[PDB]
Amino acid sequence: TAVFNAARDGKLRLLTKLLASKSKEEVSSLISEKTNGATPLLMAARYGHLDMVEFLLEQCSASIEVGGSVNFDGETIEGAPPLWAASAAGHLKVVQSLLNHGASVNNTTLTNSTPLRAACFDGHLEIVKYLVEHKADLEVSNRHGHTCLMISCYKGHKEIAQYLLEKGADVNRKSVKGNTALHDCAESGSLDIMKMLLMYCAKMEKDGYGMTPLLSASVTGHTNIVDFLTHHAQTSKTERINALELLGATFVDKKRDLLGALKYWKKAMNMRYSDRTNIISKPVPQTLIMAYDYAKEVNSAEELEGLIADPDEMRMQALLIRERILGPSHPDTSYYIRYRGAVYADSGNFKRCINLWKYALDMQQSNSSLLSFAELFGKRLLLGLDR
Template structure:
């Protein structure tokens, strides 16, 4: 009967079978498939349907939705490939290479899991990130499924691509009963993820005290991760007081470790956005200080750490008496706590900048912009010196700078200059990251493009503020350096294209109060600093093609006129054709732009000759000097 099916009929059948599987209509599926040729059935059941961000077969979507009867029908009657893989979504995560068993395990459908295993499903078939069905069940906390999978030879030692084990994910998610079962079955509590963290690090980070106790009972050690943080320090940094106090009570916890944990816990409460509590901050700072002087014969003095200007050059309290003077001085406690965090964790630890940024934001909210800038600058420098992305830092600066300009608050050019210099370095590093990382290339490209936008925001802001002659010269140098690295968007837009385009995105948190495109002042400045006025985007458009499309010529006449005139005076050719063979005047969306172009139309004999060569398809390759070939190609 399969021969009676033409491609259109099979296409319809695929949709119907998939919909029936998704909705649990087992009898309908049987009725549609039972007397068809095997080749037709295979084509229908192997077909992957894209829907709601998922790419699945009938078997996989039925397992994902817990449709046990559908699974039974497909496996018992139609020899469907039980190891088919697809792409599914779980808790906001996109899982590629997931089998039906993985989906049923992750979604908590025990009967479907049982059915699939009874029909021979591979209990250890991993996804593309090496996540097994057991890991999926551990993530969901389904002890019944975890137990069943282990009983049917699921390997609890298989870790995902980050070397994160099933025990680790259970600890992180807080599933104590699953953790207990895995430990009883021999799961090692001391396995390390690629970041150096163990199961104890993950449970301490999340504040799962009962799991921390359980891991300790099973002999978990307290190693340092790749950032030299023990589970105790991780708990203190995350504000998990009960975990800190428990680990500090253990005999193996040294006096120095206890002091550092208590002081770090207090410092966390002083500057953590989620756990801010100034009273608890002082309480734990005091406990730490009391511990230092608990034995008068063996006082543990603080290690020297050079004062940090961003923290007001705060020198930490050295005694209980000095600390008590700060009890009612919140600002002093905030700064002292930032200094304590940096001393204990070290400036290279990724967690150090977060509270610094939070405290800076608080200053910004109260219009204490200089304090904000000082703190954020420190945080940004810490991140960049450790080769961590500063994309959010750069945007954050453009937002607060815009706010200052909009409010009429004096903004020093030096601040904008410093941030822009870091931005240029970041663009260069963005390119290096993109070249080295195949897996996250798309995300890295998005960050790179966002940073190009932020650079333009900063340049517009720099042009808006008061500057002396030396600062004007320095700004031109910054623009030249920016242009020299040749930043380009994925559509081929150069910075000059972006500045000429009214559709260029502008951040809507304060930035759009100051920055808008097209921007004549920045376009003129970029041209003066060497921007390539004839650079082509992916459609062959030069900046002149872009600006003539500006759709608000009445209110923005001066902008339109200045940019067009600047481009023409700098040598932009009026007869350059884009890949649709259109010159700029043919791209005008308003008569105003056309009039401006025609008023300044000066087409040289050389341009006419180039157009004649192109229009008549005269061969010129390898017959002329390279610079003339490039010139002809533009036309």
């Protein structure tokens, strides 16, 4: 009835007032009642009321595996059992108690997120170890194929990632979109974790977008990952050049730092022309692009030194570089075409703005729906990066 708000907030004396003036068998169905999606035990465990939890189990352990709505960071998560909620929130003693009463360490939310995964999200090292020691399966992933190892590297949790690897987590797992734990390290800039995965011979692979961890780091702008990986023997000379040219474009468009962009473009131009036996010349696109003002990529160290006095030329180089390396189906390509058009509109160049926006629209229509104009004006559950 209202004994659901009782367990939700922890007052055990309020609850037991009704549990004495109750039935030895219909106290059962009062606690097994979904009040706004959640059982009373689900909310006692969500909010860490250890004594509320052990009293409710000693009455009736029927709701121990039933999941419902629970709230985290404002948003509501569905089908979450009590052990899961206790581990997302960090209540270790609750977790230890639910297991003592035979809760299933493997029962998941409807995204197929295990108790282990939720504990690794928020960094609860001491819950993670207890779950693993109570036979949690390290390799159960969510419905996108994202693992506990991937999420703990994406979040930067070095100690947790280290423990999972010591317990035998497969370092080369791939999600359904081809993401490996080395990609998550590249996206979060966790160089120290990336080095630790390489101690287990983690293989660098292209994901669905065709991104290696190196290219993923040049996209998100993590220069520590790019500097490390472009001196790693598992990346070829051509992949280094492209990663540095892509990183420069990211400097232009995301970091708004044209001096750092040139530093990376010069580094790349030198490697192209370092070995005079074998020139590595820029590929040639099928046609010149009106939205790019018909620019073409610089092809020599000399065309590079004039660019710093030409911010507009650098912005077109960045777009050429990004369309060449990432291609038309990568969301950042049309995103930064639109952003560059937006900057031109804000400076009065409505024709350049419109031609850029026309092109970005023709691009995505001849081939990530949270990057429309309407949605940018009005997020990670779409990518499977959620709890």
